[PDB]
DNA sequence: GACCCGCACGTACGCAGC
DNA sequence: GCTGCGTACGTGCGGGTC
């Protein structure tokens, strides 16, 4: 009959106790006042690890206006699957603010079965790039990485519009042109005789995959089936021959369509940079 | 009655991070005292962004600043190109190009001069903002012409395209190379080599490539040596 | 007019000594 | 040989979001 009021006593204390001390030490955070001391408890444990960590791994390598005037974001992250810091602007580009993504696994929000090859990524061997794609009713979302790695890896992102809506001067040197799902010439825009100079009608079925040159054609294979994978596509550095020979120098990010009546990637097209001027003018190839 | 197990695990996940940050401080209410006494001695974005993807920042209008190790990436001084004007220091198809592109957001490559620059910006005051970024022969059917071969197996291209190999290749080991284009037909990844010959003994490397879609070997693709 | 989750309220015990 | 600190687990009670 004794025992019971002790223990609830003495209970009732140390809970009080341990839920003050918690959010004190949630109080002194990176984050203002209105939206960091009203947020559950689970978040604030895994918060203030994320900017010990990012305050500490950053002076391990260490000795205004650089944020904008960029396109896109800076994530980074560790071999154990979990980001620590984001850039601001992560609210512009995928929907999600840096409080909810702070700390949780990028294997929750990537797409299953799409994840061996970042985890074999993130491990130990300087210089790697890859691709990756990202996030309620949550549609899914593509992206590029560039970066270099510590043991961590510091990202940039930058995410491929969609031509359908294009905010951006394309440039007298930037023609249009649409393609087939088997790399075939469909269709080419009334920009190109300046540039390097064919006639639309033998624009047609002949296959595209002539035109590459040497190792060209061995890496577009992994591009073209990187398109066929994912739904993007940045190719790295590759030419494309002339009415008379010669290589000129093009580059590209391509896109798939979806179909509203339909599940199938339909349609492929392409955005084209024209890069150098004709060259080898004279010696022919084919 | 099952929520036992969804409350079980976040308990496991709450003590597991209540009990890791000892490693991450240099030394369990006591534990959480001494971590909110440790948070109150608490340009870091350089120390990344710098070696995250190259390229340093320039201003346009002349230009009017950039920043202090340029000439890392684009070699030039600090006062050689301020008071001094971009478009003599440029080629003049980016010349065109640039004034054509003076006048929201902007993605653009450059030919700049002592080299190809990705660099997108956008405009301020008028005046821009930018960040800046940086014995053998190849042919296969031969549909293609290499650069060297002529000169290597002595024939000018109006005498080699748009035939096959073995119509004028001298057929006195035909067989065993048969036998290697047979293997080599289907078997995709990495073929090695054995001996062939024209007069001039050429060792074929042939890789089987193959459209990711439509699912039926096409075209090969050679790194024809000696 | 409610379903799922986070926080709080209850106890049945490993341990050190007078 | 038997009593207060630190601990583990079950149960309810009440706040959003569709």
Not at chain 2, 47 to 73: N, P, Q, W, Y
Not at chain 2, 99 to 118: G, P, Y
């Amino acid at each position: 009959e004794l025992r019971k009021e002790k223990s609830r006593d003495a209970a009732r204390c140390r809970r009080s106790k341990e839920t003050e001390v918690f959010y004190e030490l949630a109080h002194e955070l990176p984050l203002p006042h209105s939206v960091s001391s009203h947020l559950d408890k689970a978040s604030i444990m895994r918060l203030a690890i994320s900017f010990l960590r990012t305050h500490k791994l950053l002076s391990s390598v260490c000795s205004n206006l650089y944020l904008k005037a960029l396109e896109g974001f800076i994530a980074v992250v560790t071999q154990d699957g979990d980001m620590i810091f984001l850039s601001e602007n992560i609210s512009k580009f995928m929907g999600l603010t840096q409080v909810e993504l702070t700390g949780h696994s990028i294997f929750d929000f990537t797409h299953p079965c799409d994840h061996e090859e970042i985890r074999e990524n993130l491990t130990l061997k300087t210089e790697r790039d890859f691709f990756m794609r990202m996030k309620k009713s949550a549609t899914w979302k593509v992206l590029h990485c560039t970066g270099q790695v510590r043991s961590c890896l510091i990202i940039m992102c930058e995410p491929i519009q969609h031509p359908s809506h294009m905010d951006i001067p394309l440039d007298s040197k930037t023609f249009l042109s649409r393609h087939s799902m088997d790399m075939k010439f469909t269709y080419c825009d009334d920009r190109i005789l300046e540039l390097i100079g064919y006639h639309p009608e033998e624009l047609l079925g002949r296959s595209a995959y002539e035109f590459y040159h040497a190792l060209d054609s061995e890496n577009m294979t992994k591009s073209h089936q990187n398109l066929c994978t994912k739904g993007q596509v940045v190719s790295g550095q590759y030419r494309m021959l002339a009415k008379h020979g010669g290589y000129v120098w093009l580059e590209t990010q391509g896109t798939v369509i979806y179909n509203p009546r339909n599940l199938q990637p339909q349609c492929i097209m392409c955005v084209n940079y024209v890069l150098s001027e004709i060259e080898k003018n004279d010696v022919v190839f084919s | 009655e099952a929520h036992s197990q969804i409350e079980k695990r976040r308990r496991d996940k709450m003590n597991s991070f209540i009990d890791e940050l000892a490693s991450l401080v240099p030394t369990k209410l006591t534990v959480l005292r001494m971590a909110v006494q440790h948070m109150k001695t608490l340009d870091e974005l350089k120390h990344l962004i710098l070696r995250a993807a190259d390229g340093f920042l320039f201003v346009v209008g002349k230009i009017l600043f950039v920043s202090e190790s340029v000439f890392k990436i684009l070699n030039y001084s600090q006062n050689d190109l301020i008071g001094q004007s971009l478009f003599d220091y440029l080629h003049p198809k980016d010349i065109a190009k640039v004034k054509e592109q003076l006048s929201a957001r902007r993605s653009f490559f450059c030919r700049m001069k002592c080299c190809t620059i990705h660099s997108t910006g956008y405009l301020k005051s008028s005046c821009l903002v930018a960040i800046g970024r940086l014995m053998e022969y190849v042919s296969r059917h031969f549909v293609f012409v290499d650069q060297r071969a002529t000169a290597i197996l002595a024939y000018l291209p109006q005498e080699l395209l748009g035939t096959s190999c073995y119509e004028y290749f001298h057929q006195d080991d035909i067989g065993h190379l048969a036998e290697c284009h047979r293997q080599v037909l289907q078997t995709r990844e990495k073929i090695t080599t054995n001996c062939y010959k024209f007069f001039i003994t050429l060792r074929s490397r042939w890789f089987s490539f193959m459209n990711p879609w439509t699912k039926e070997v096409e075209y090969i693709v050679s790194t024809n040596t000696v």
